[PDB]
Design a protein around this ligand. Structure first.
Ligand code: AGS
Ligand code: AGS
Ligand code: CL
Ligand code: MG
Ligand code: MG
Ligand code: MG
Ligand code: MG
Ligand code: NA
Lengths: 385, 386
């Protein structure tokens, strides 16, 4: 591995496609190794751009645009932060010699539930929830019919629980199908798990390594809190890793992956996977020697991970206000930091509704205490408009 | 404590005067809190400018120049990273309402050896080496004869051991003086024979004075080569060291992290000098603590409470200090400089012309001895070319 000096002619260049808070930390980790960072997004002043060398505002769903910025910047690595990109142009660019992290196929399979679900379920023969894909309400209707209640319906091209609907009644169908169209879907058979985890799996030169399992709390399709390590059976864990390894290897390429699983007893079920750092993984900003962000960069740059140290019970708790403003201020911060307590404020230029503006990070003697400590600090911050 | 959003009208603005690798980290820590950062230095593309919202290049020794840029960016805080700045204007600005970190007086006192030495030694009555100042070659010679041999002569305005001579005899008098003139006034200090020296990273915050675990370091030709933490010391030495550090920081005044340099002779501690800001030897904290010295400085000067500092066990830093002339430096064999319990930092410095710290290797282990070896080893693996 040979790295140049940022801004100099031999500099190594990283293009970030998506400049939110996750991209912001990858940017910091690149900066730490003197890697040149170009932050791209669909709006100006996205958090990653504050810390990048330069930025571009584009319609990332626009392949030609994507091609134009890439071509212009000639990056060594292209790192997408989100799903909402023209993965087709990624494939081409890759085919053309660009290094897409972890690999372009990976991005593609994961932006569509059909791909990923089929791969895992069918191709890899892994435990997942019961499901069915539908192209028409009739079929939708037909499908929900076969899955039963309750059931989840999601757009094959959805995230943050967008267009999704939890179905316990035939009456929602009308709207359910409509939401899911707001035109193909999946109907999944609700799983009754003890808890949900994120298994942060890094694929690198020295193989696949796992971070301690990350548990978390979702609400209204937003993770609220995450913690590490989530208490799991040795057997349960062994199984989770097996599934994660098969999947990551199956998708291919070096990088940090967020493998979403459900745990019931010693039983593990595959849900989905992010071919990049996952929001729940923000707890690794205080819980490990190497954050998920640092791991992603180490991996993609072709460097060996070797090992991941975990520092005890730890937690993250989001700062998720809901208001409209283009001039947010945060008061009472002195009560949101302290021993074994930190906070991050993203630099997002405005908000109009519900948005994640920062996160509180905490460590403690117990996972439970870590969670309270983190929750309490996020809650002391007064978000003003 | 109220913080705005960077780039927004109510943004909280921080101006860094000096954009080196130390400033770089301070900038990342500000950015992590959505703090707006303007990086200033005497050359372009300096490390911290890589991560700043905006950058300017001026003569920071020029009071007028300084005032212009402050007028132009209207920062809430002015954060000096080096000694060579218009301290007299800082004072003005601080009176004109600007927050100089930790304070403008602390900055004036420490910009020259005389200010800080007389304060510590005379006003604070802290233990220090014997010393004598001199402004002529003859007075220089008079000071040596009074101080005796061996002794060390140093220019009053300097750092990273520039123009310093470890004088063992009269033979060296002449060259010593000349070289000293190369880096006016000089200091002649008596040689302290300590067991080891430390940097005690002291944080003055709204909630008091906090101490990081002692950092030991090894110096060579003006540059620190390795640093490690914690450095073992008796309980008594640790207490005396913390008493000294608390006195000096409070005496200097203001919130921030300070780098208190001490010599340790068994249970006795002697004051050497102090950085009114993060210290290069403290880079080990980038791997060894929950909050690096940079995260700490920011926390403190923003007026937030520290609460406390977590130390993760034995660790060390080892500099990447090549010697070459280039404006396009590259680093190879990187795959053999990082791994389990092993990391590196590459600063992004635009050029080199001789010896210059371009990065640092960091490692943790079960003992400082193993950490240091691991870290020197990794730094050594890096193939610097240009
Ligand atoms: N079959 C299922 N059984 C039980 N809970 C489910 C099921 N599918 C989803 N969930 C829950 O819903 C959350 C979001 O479901 P996802 O399928 O991950 O949706 P998404 O829109 O892709 O959200 P992201 O991308 O993970 S943020 C999960 O984290 C679970 O809490
Ligand atoms: N009186 C003294 N006795 C014995 N050793 C000394 C004495 N003064 C300095 N040294 C040694 O020389 C090193 C450099 O001295 P400094 O006074 O710190 O020089 P410097 O130019 O200010 O370097 P910086 O500011 O730390 S980068 C110290 O870290 C000690 O190792
Ligand atoms: Cl004197
Ligand atoms: Mg998803
Ligand atoms: Mg999910
Ligand atoms: Mg000095
Ligand atoms: Mg010194
Ligand atoms: Na001040």
């Amino acid at each position: 591995t040979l790295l140049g000096t940022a801004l100099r002619p031999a500099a190594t260049r990283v293009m970030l496609l998506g400049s939110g808070e996750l991209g912001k930390e990858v940017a910091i980790e690149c900066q730490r190794l003197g890697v040149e960072v170009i932050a791209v997004d669909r709006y100006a002043d996205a958090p990653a751009m504050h810390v990048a060398h330069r930025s571009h505002v584009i319609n990332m769903l626009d392949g030609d645009a994507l091609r134009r910025v890439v071509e212009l910047e000639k990056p060594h690595y292209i790192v997408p932060e989100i799903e909402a990109i023209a993965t087709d142009m990624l494939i081409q660019l890759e085919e053309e010699g660009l290094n897409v992290v972890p690999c372009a196929r990976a991005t593609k399979l994961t932006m569509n539930r059909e791909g990923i679900r089929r791969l895992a379920a069918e191709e890899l023969q892994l435990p997942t929830s019961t499901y069915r894909f539908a192209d028409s309400e009739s079929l939708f209707r037909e499908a929900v019919a076969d899955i039963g209640y309750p059931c989840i319906v999601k757009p094959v091209m959805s995230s943050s629980g967008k267009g999704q609907t939890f179905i316990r009644s035939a009456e929602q169908l009308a709207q359910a199908w409509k939401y899911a169209q707001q035109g193909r879907v999946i109907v999944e058979g609700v799983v009754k798990f003890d808890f949900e985890i994120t298994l942060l799996t890094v694929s690198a030169v020295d193989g696949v390594h796992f971070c301690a399992p990350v548990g978390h709390r979702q609400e209204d399709g937003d993770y609220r809190e995450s913690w590490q390590p989530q208490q799991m059976s040795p057997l349960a864990l062994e199984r989770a890793q097996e599934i994660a390894r098969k999947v990551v290897l199956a998708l291919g390429g070096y990088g940090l992956f967020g493998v979403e699983l459900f745990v019931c007893g010693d039983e593990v079920i595959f849900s989905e996977v992010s071919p990049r750092p996952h929001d729940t993984g923000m707890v690794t900003l205080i819980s490990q020697d190497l954050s998920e962000f640092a791991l992603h960069v180490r991996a993609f740059l072709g460097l060996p991970v070797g090992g991941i140290r975990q520092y005890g019970p730890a937690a993250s708790a989001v700062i998720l206000p809901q208001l409209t403003s283009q001039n947010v201020t945060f008061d009472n911060v002195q009560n949101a930091v302290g021993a074994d307590l930190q906070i991050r404020l993203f630099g997002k230029p405005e908000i109009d509704g519900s948005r994640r503006l920062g996160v509180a990070l905490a460590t403690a003697e117990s996972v439970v205490d870590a969670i309270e400590r983190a929750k309490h600090a996020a809650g002391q911050v007064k978000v003003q408009g």
